[PDB]
Amino acid sequence: MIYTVTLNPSIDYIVQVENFQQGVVNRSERDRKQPGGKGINVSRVLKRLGHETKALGFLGGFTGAYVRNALEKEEIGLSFIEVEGDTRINVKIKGKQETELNGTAPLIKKEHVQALLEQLTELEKGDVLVLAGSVPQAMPQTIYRSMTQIAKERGAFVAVDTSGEALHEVLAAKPSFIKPNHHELSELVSKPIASIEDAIPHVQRLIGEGIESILVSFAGDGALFASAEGMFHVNVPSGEVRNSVGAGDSVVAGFLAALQEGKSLEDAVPFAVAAGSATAFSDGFCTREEVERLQQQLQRTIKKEG
Amino acid sequence: MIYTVTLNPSIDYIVQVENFQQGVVNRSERDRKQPGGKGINVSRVLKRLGHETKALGFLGGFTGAYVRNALEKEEIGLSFIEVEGDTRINVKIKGKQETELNGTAPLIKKEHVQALLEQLTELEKGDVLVLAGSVPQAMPQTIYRSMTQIAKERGAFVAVDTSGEALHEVLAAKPSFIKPNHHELSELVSKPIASIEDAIPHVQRLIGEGIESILVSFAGDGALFASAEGMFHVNVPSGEVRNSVGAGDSVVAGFLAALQEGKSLEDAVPFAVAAGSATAFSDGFCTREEVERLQQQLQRTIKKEG
Numbered sequence A, B: 001m002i003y004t005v006t007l008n009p010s011i012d013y014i015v016q017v018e019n020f021q022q023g024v025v026n027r028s029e030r031d032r033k034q035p036g037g038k039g040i041n042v043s044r045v046l047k048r049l050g051h052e053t054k055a056l057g058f059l060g061g062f063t064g065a066y067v068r069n070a071l072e073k074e075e076i077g078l079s080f081i082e083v084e085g086d087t088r089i090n091v092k093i094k095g096k097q098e099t100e101l102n103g104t105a106p107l108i109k110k111e112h113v114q115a116l117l118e119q120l121t122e123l124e125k126g127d128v129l130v131l132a133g134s135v136p137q138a139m140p141q142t143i144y145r146s147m148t149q150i151a152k153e154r155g156a157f158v159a160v161d162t163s164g165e166a167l168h169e170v171l172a173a174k175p176s177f178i179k180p181n182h183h184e185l186s187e188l189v190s191k192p193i194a195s196i197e198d199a200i201p202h203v204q205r206l207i208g209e210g211i212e213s214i215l216v217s218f219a220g221d222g223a224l225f226a227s228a229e230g231m232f233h234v235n236v237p238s239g240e241v242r243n244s245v246g247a248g249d250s251v252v253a254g255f256l257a258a259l260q261e262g263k264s265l266e267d268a269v270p271f272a273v274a275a276g277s278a279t280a281f282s283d284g285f286c287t288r289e290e291v292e293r294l295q296q297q298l299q300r301t302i303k304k305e306g
Helices: A038-048 A061-073 A110-120 A143-152 A164-173 A182-189 A196-208 A247-260 A265-281 A288-298 B038-048 B061-073 B143-152 B165-173 B182-186 B200-208 B248-260 B265-280 B288-300
Strands: A002-006 A010-016 A025-027 A030-036 A054-060 A081-083 A088-094 A099-101 A128-132 A157-161 A213-217 A223-227 A230-234 B002-006 B010-016 B030-036 B054-059 B088-094 B100-102 B128-132 B157-161 B213-217 B223-227 B230-234
Touching (some): A002 A038, A010 A061, A030 A038, A030 A061, A038 A054, A038 A061, A054 A061, A061 B061, A081 A110, A128 A247, A143 A157, A143 A164, A157 A164, A157 A247, A182 A196, A196 A213, A196 A223, A196 A230, A213 A247, A213 A265, A223 A265, A230 A265, A247 A265, B002 B038, B030 B061, B038 B054, B038 B061, B038 B128, B038 B248, B054 B061, B128 B143, B128 B248, B143 B157, B143 B165, B157 B165, B213 B265, B230 B265
Parallel strands (some): A002 A054, A010 A088, A054 A081, B002 B054, B002 B128, B010 B088, B128 B157
Antiparallel strands (some): A010 A030, A088 A099, A223 A230, B010 B030, B213 B223, B223 B230
């Protein structure tokens, strides 16, 4: 049904140290590690929302074994291609400041990329393909455009959450749904967008260019959703954000979980934004209960637009 | 024959990064992962110098599995005790400002910190017990004092490489060898130090309390050795130090390797100081051939003390 692709998964090593300072021996007070990567995170959250997914991508070494074991324990569908190097270890330092340091991508022989593309020919009509995250530089940045084509030639629904050249490249493939935050969208059109008004003309050009739906977040300023069927705004429940290591991925899962449940593209927006917020407010990720709650609240702030 | 103890072992994650800012992101340019822990390093460097050893300590979690697999490949003797906790990960960032980030020590039950002491009971006359590295706050900072005893009461040679209360409390136990750098010595004799003479009176008193040998390195300026047979100085090879990760652990391994091969306490010093700077003048752990060479260099640099 729903397939997620994570080209560069990882072990997110989350560490809070209210004292983290350069050139010095920092100790940790609170340590945690969890499998990471945008595709993987959409899977995990989907699971928490009661939906299965089959996770795809590349995994290597003991760190990859850790990632595979974990998803296994969470009873999440998976079919990763083993690679030679080790899966990267990403370091997330919380506390006073918020500093990140990503590990190097592991080498991926061309045969593996060919095998990953091979798996996609398995998508059937009505399946969903989620391509989220960065594309290792060693790989053709047009990779998502390729995977989207394979998917579309099989009737599969494509949801994309990337940036840079990779996102620019995917457009010609006309995926079904994209979710750029306002900064990613500004980067895509090479123009600044700070308000809902700044984005509307561009969104309208994208829908007419074949993109079926788009959801642009403006952080604590709500979200804008456009479909050839319409355009409207929605607010965020507001609250103290206790975490921010997979909130955009939650929005994607929420949207897709709702679509699975038969709701309409428009009707799904409320649930997705809430899922993002729920995760943004809890130490870990959102729960089916939390989302439903917040969603009820947001399902009114719905202001038309366009 | 030579036992090493590592209470808080770990996987050392070295990541080279330039212009390693803060608050934002940071992409590694080069990564590296290997077993960490002072005792562990001593066993690894001893292996390279041609000598076996059995490493003891506490490992847990997939991280602990890694440590164990790696040492088993280097064919290093071992017998750690599995604790329900997850061996830590210390992120050693390098560049123009090598920083560090030590992970939260796992969790060790009493019966564990007891089956260990229980292992020491096998020690025999002529054996060697190496105690190095800080102590997990989850344990009493007197733990080395306690082990030295068991060890000493068995004709075993105890060498210690620590600092802080831990180092302070071991003294009354009368260990056979300690290597406080000129600083740790100030942090011990609770008094500042500087001259090569500003330490002899104090290294003298320590020897008089029952401690067999003391090796105190003046960072960049040489090192002083003291035993009941008198003392002498030796200068450091002098060269470009690329790595520091495990230099002190090398002087210790060198000193022990040299005594294993029959050489005397004082005659083993050159060899130990050689292993130290041979590891430092490199991007990895020193090789036998390297030590022997610089050994001769330092061999001539020998001056008795007044």
